[PDB]
Write a protein that binds this ligand. Sequence first.
Ligand code: NI
Length: 341
Amino acid sequence: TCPFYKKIPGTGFTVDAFQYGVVEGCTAYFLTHFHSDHYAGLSKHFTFPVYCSEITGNLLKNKLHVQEQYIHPLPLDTECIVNGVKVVLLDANHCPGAVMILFYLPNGTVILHTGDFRADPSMERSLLADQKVHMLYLDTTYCSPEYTFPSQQEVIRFAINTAFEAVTLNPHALVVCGTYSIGKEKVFLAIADVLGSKVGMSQEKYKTLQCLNIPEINSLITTDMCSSLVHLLPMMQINFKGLQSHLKKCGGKYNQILAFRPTGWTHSNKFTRIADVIPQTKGNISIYGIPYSEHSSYLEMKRFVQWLKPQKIIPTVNVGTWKSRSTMEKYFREWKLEAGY
Ligand code: NI
């Protein structure tokens, strides 16, 4: 059944709750972003109102074929009324079109639902600064102190410098980047930019990227693989067997692959710096795992919460085990006692 952390009390609303059939008493289904664990269940047969960003609405229409009459896009940073209740959508710093949602309940309670987010100090100057938030539905994906990772900027600098060096040493090297969802587009776009190439990809992935309102996108991507020296492939294919295979397909245009796997966290983060990362190599193929995250580090999460000072926190990630739930509740209490709220 629909879990309680997907329901917004005092409303008929649910958030990211599309896989339970008809939720009894739901008058509006919000969708925070277009990732499969969140939209799971939506299709062309859905006949209830869906409230989302413009970009998520483009993806619902074009990729899932949800009918236009049930898609309700809202602008960001704008007070809107939905079934009698004031809401605001805020940028979540996750993947394209990802939002946080502020609900202003008729009784005076204010609720923030983060969806998936990567907390940033810039959020402390949004419409969130303007009133008190009583209840926080929090993306707790990396809520443990071992989870450190570098900034997105540091990671992109590493990838750009690595690729440019390799291709300038060997003009017959191919760059490949893995993907299995939207998000992390900066990785392959920044590398293609430094190399003066467009990124080549499948027709399905090109269609997905054409929904994202990225400026000048027609200048940056293509379905012509032969004219491109940065290829995107399914993340599943980013291994030695899959890459040797791909290289055979390029018809002796290339003699070397340099591949990037943008992982979330991996335990080499507890020891190794970004300057010190090394690839796995077999023959003329090298694979780099780079820690490009679109979720909060533990310290970024802690700073956000200690700034916001919520009265109650409801985790939305890692909720399935008693040990995880108890560990998270311990951190929340530490944070509250340290900051004095
Ligand atoms: Ni997500």
